[PDB]
């Protein structure tokens, strides 16, 4: 019908503009994806009639590139949209059967390509885990209400015992980025690191609140729940130790609380 | 007055293998509440009983002292806290029999605990097992600097307590069982205070200085071990029919 052809025309215009901007955000230039392109993509995710699966597909397509720069930038763009985009974006990623498949990515173009490939593998793992974390609880741990009246401080015991290990698993994937400050020496890896830093602070806050809630419930828990809690507590200690190391790397390159 | 106290201390600490009798403990508690009772003389009577060579007399004098620290007027534990020395039983030995040998080990550990309980009280001028709890209580509202100084005091007291290190199959007479019941009541309450200190520290995570975070992390690491030990302590209690109803 005429109505259908007119509608198809608009959807074509829209799709092409998104794909083009994804390419712009993911050029071979060794710099983070440009703000103007990220802002444009964020706005796209907020348009009721933008096609989210097509947007995601464009980003996945860029991760099939052989250039570490294109691949890492597509991952950074995806992360940025998970954080700053409309919730429909992360929700779509959470609904998928598969996400990034980069565990064997390797760019052997040069020493920098080799070094960056390791970080691409670790970062891809983190974004997959971030999506699966969202799927399991239907919310983003880094965004929920905090404080005494917030989500993690008020959660019931049974749900809490299921939920803290999900936070722990996400935090592990995040910290396993395992970069040192002497390695944060190009705008691509630095852009990824800044997003990881913002996530880590917020994710740790949620983790910590979960632990506080569990400790408050100590005398009220069943014997077996106490055992699960103690295991959660013990694992939390090592993650707090690692978070302090992560914060030190950030401080060494001039990233601190002001950047949260 | 003094003679009546001394006599009752003796009755609380006879050679009979049974915990000190309630009627005598109640009498001593009332004594501590009499404005004109002499606390130092009461304490001295208890110390003198711990110079006895019988494990039964010595252990019962320690239990009587512990009972008064817990249930007596606060002037009693305050006086103990003010002393230059307390119990000196680290080499006590009633090598008169197997039971005497076995019990001597527990007397040494228990006396260490009571010394630590008094010194804990001295350092903060209150009893961790008695303070107001909950969101508006002492440990949940304490400021960061004081908290960092205070949790290690709790930890040190808890270590001396758990170091009693008894097994359920060693709890086989009314004397050691009376000491154990007091230790259990202290341990539950002391752990509640310890736990509240930890919660308060965790709440302050993002607000602490770098160095404070390091101190806090050490505190949290040590807390894990004590929680693990408390769990084992609670099982020993459960194995001899002591639980929450006995708190």
Residues of chain B with Cβ-Cβ distance to A234 below 8 Å are: 224
Asked if B118 and B69 touch (Cβ cutoff 8 Å), the reply is yes
Q: Give the integer Cα–Cα distance in Å for B198 and B214.
A: 14
CA distance B188 to chain A (A): 9
Task: Tell me how far apart the alpha carbons of residues B72 and B79 are, in angstroms, rounded to a whole number.
Answer: 12
**Contact of B176 with B146, CB cutoff 8 Å:** no
Cβ-proximal residues to B27 (8 Å cutoff; 6+ apart), any chain: B8
Q: How far is CA B128 from CA B67, B68, B219, B244, in A?
A: 16, 16, 17, 19
How far apart (Å, rounded) are the C-alpha atoms in residues A67 and A65?
A: 6
- Class for domain B1-129, per CATH? mainly alpha
Instruction: Calculate ∠ Cα A132-A133-A134, nearest 5°.
Output: 90
* Among candidates A212, A226, A244 on the partner chain, residue whose Cβ is nearest the Cβ of B199: A212
Q: How far apart (Å, rounded) are the C-alpha atoms in residues A15 and A50?
A: 8
Task: Please identify which residue in the block is written with the tokens 């980025």.
Answer: A177
Residue A199 to chain B, least CA–CA distance (Å): 15
Residue A149's SS3 state is: coil
Q: Half-sphere exposure of A226 toward its Cβ, with a 13 Å CA cutoff?
A: 14
DSSP state of A30: S
Contact B74, B190 (CB under 8 A): no
> Rounded CA gap, B244 and A218, in Å?
13
- What is the rounded distance in angstroms from the CA atom of residue A201 to the CA atom of residue A19? 32
Chosen for mutation from A213, A216, A227 (greatest number of chain B CBs closer than 10 Å) is A216
Burial of B79 (0-12, 13-18, 19+ CB in 10 A): middle
Of A105, A99, A101, A129, which is closest to residue A118 (Cα–Cα)?
A105
User: What is the Cα–Cα distance from A242 to B191, expressed in whole angstroms?
Assistant: 27
In contact, B194 and B226? CB cutoff 8 Å? yes
Q: Which of A218, A234, A244 sits opposite B213 (nearest CB)?
A: A244
Match domain A1-142 to its CATH number in 3.40.50.300, 3.40.50.720, 2.30.30.90, 1.25.40.90.
1.25.40.90
Of B192, B202, B206, which has the smallest distance from its Cβ to A211's Cβ?
B202
How close, in Å, is residue B118 to chain A by CA atoms? 26
**Residue B17, both tokens:** 């293998």
Q: How many residues does chain B have?
A: 247
B224 and A211: CB-CB below 8 Å?
no
Q: In this structure, what is the dihedral angle of CA atoms B127, B131, B134, B136, given to the nearest 10 degrees?
A: -120
For residue B210, the chain A residue with the least C-alpha distance is: A244
Q: Which CATH architecture has domain A143-260?
A: Up-down Bundle (1.20)
From chain B, pick out residues whose CB is under 8 angstroms from the CB of A233.
224, 227
- Residue A32 DSSP label: P
Which residue in the set B199, B205, B224 is minimally distant from A234, CB to CB? B224
What's A33's DSSP letter?
Answer: P
Residue A52's alpha-carbon distances to A36, A82, A123, A219, B175, in angstroms, are 19, 12, 22, 47, 74
> Furthest-apart CA pair in chain A: how many Å?
69
Sign of CA dihedral A42, A94, A208, A198: negative
Chain B residue whose CA is closest to A238: B221
CB contact under 8 Å between B231 and A230, yes or no, is: yes
Which residues in A lie closer than 8 A to residue B231 (C-beta atoms)? 226, 230
Q: Which tokens hold the place of A137?
A: 């609880």
Rounded distance, CA B151 to CA B133, Å?
A: 15
Residues of B in contact with A211 (CB under 8 A): 202
CB B70 within 8 A of CB B28: no
What is the DSSP secondary-structure string of A184-233?
--SHHHHHHHHHHHHHHHHHHHHHHHHHHHHHHTGGGS-HHHHHHHHHHH
* CA–CA distance, B161 with B156 (Å, rounded to integer): 9
Rounded to whole angstroms, the Cα distance separating A132 from A128 reads 6
3 state SS of A110:
coil
Cβ atoms of B120 and B153 closer than 8 Å = yes
Work out the number of other CB atoms within 10 angstroms of the CB of residue A28.
Answer: 10
CA of B180: how far to CAs of B102, B168, B240, in Å?
15, 10, 11
In angstroms, the Cα distances linking A77 to A37, A198, A256, B130 are 9, 15, 22, 56
Largest CA distance in chain B: 59
- Altogether, the residues listed in chain A come to a count of 260
> For residue A226, what is the nearest residue in chain B, using CA coordinates?
B231
CB under 8 Å, gap of 24 or more: what pairs does B238-241 form? B239/B168, B240/B168, B240/B171, B240/B177, B240/B180
Task: Pick the closest to residue A195 from A210, A209, A207, A179 (CA basis).
Answer: A179
Instruction: Give, in order, the Cα–Cα distances in Å from B95 to each of A96, B53, B172.
Output: 74, 9, 18
**Cβ partners under 8 Å of residue B31, min gap 6:** B5, B8, B37, B42
Structure tokens at A172: 């592990």
- 3-class SS string, A41-100: HHHHHHCCCCCHHHHHHHHHHHCCCCCHHHHHHHHHHHHHHHHHCCHHHHHHHHHCCCCC
Cα A221 to chain center, whole Å?
33
Give the position of tokens 């403990």.
B25
Tokens of B220: 């949290």
Query: What are the domain boundaries of chain A?
Result: 1-142, 143-260
HEC assignment per residue over chain B: CHHHHHHHHHHHCCCCCCCCCHHHHHHHHHHHHCCCCCHHHHHHHHHHHCCCCCHHHHHHHHHHHHHHHHHCCHHHHHHHHHCCCCCCCCCCCCCCCHHHHHHHHHHHHHHHHHHHHHHHHHHHCCCCCCCCCCCCCHHHHCCHHHHHHHHHHHHHHHHHHHCCCCCHHHCCCHHHHHHHHHHHHHHHHHHHHHHHHHHHHHHCHHHCCHHHHHHHHHHHHHHHHHHHHHHHHHHHHHHCCCCHHHC
3-state percent helix, strand, coil for chain A, nearest multiple of 5: 75, 0, 25
Q: Which two tokens stand for residue A85?
A: 């985009």
Q: B124 near B150, Cβ under 8 Å?
A: yes
Q: Do B202 and A219 touch (CB under 8 A)?
A: no
Q: From the options 1.20.58.150, 1.10.150.20, 3.40.50.300, 3.90.226.10, give the CATH code of B130-247.
A: 1.20.58.150
Subunit contact B221:A212, Cβ cutoff 8 A: no
Nearest-CA distance B125 → chain A (Å):
26
Contact B202 A216 (CB under 8 A): no
Encoding tokens for residue B136? 């508006």
Q: Report chain A residues touching chain B, CB-CB < 8 A.
A: 205, 208, 211-212, 215-216, 218-219, 226, 230, 233-234, 237, 240-241, 244
Residue of B nearest to A223 (CA): B231
Contact between B195 and A212 using a beta-carbon 8 Å cutoff: no
Hey, are the CB atoms on B228 and A230 less than 8 Å from each other? yes
Q: Please tell me the distance from the alpha carbon of residue A193 to that of residue A190, in angstroms, as a whole number.
A: 5
d(CA B140, CA B131): 11
What's the CA gap between B12 and B14, in Å, rounded?
6
Residue A147 tokens, joined: 């404080």
Token pair for B24: 């005598």
Give me A6's structure tokens. 């007119």
* Alpha-carbon span B55 to B7, nearest angstrom: 19
């Amino acid at each position: 019908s005429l109505t259908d052809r007119i509608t198809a025309a608009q959807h074509s215009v829209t799709g092409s503009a998104v794909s083009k901007t994804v390419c712009k955000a993911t050029t071979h230039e060794i710099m983070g994806p440009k703000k103007k392109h990220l802002d444009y993509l964020i706005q796209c995710t907020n348009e009721m009639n933008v096609n989210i699966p097509q947007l995601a597909d464009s980003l996945f397509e860029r991760t099939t590139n052989s250039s570490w720069v294109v691949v890492f930038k597509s991952l950074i763009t995806t992360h940025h949209l998970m954080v700053y985009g409309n919730e429909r974006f992360i929700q779509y990623l959470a609904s998928r059967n598969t996400l990034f498949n980069l565990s064997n990515f390797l760019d052997k173009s040069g020493l920098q390509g080799y070094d960056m490939s390791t970080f691409i593998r670790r970062y891809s793992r983190y974004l997959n885990e971030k999506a699966v974390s969202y799927r399991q609880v239907a919310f983003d741990f880094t965004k929920v209400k905090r404080g005494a009246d917030g989500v993690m401080r008020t959660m019931n015991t049974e749900k809490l015992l299921k939920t803290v290990p999900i936070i722990q698993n996400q935090m592990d994937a995040l910290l396993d980025f395992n970069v040192n400050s002497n390695e944060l020496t190009n705008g691509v890896i630095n852009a990824a690191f800044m997003l990881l830093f913002k996530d880590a602070i917020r994710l740790f806050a949620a983790y910590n609140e979960g632990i506080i809630n569990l400790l408050e419930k100590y005398f009220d828990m069943k014997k077996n729940q106490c055992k699960e809690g103690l295991d959660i507590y013990k694992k939390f200690l090592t993650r707090m130790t690692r978070i302090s190391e992560f914060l030190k790397v950030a401080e060494q390159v001039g990233i601190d609380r002001g950047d949260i």
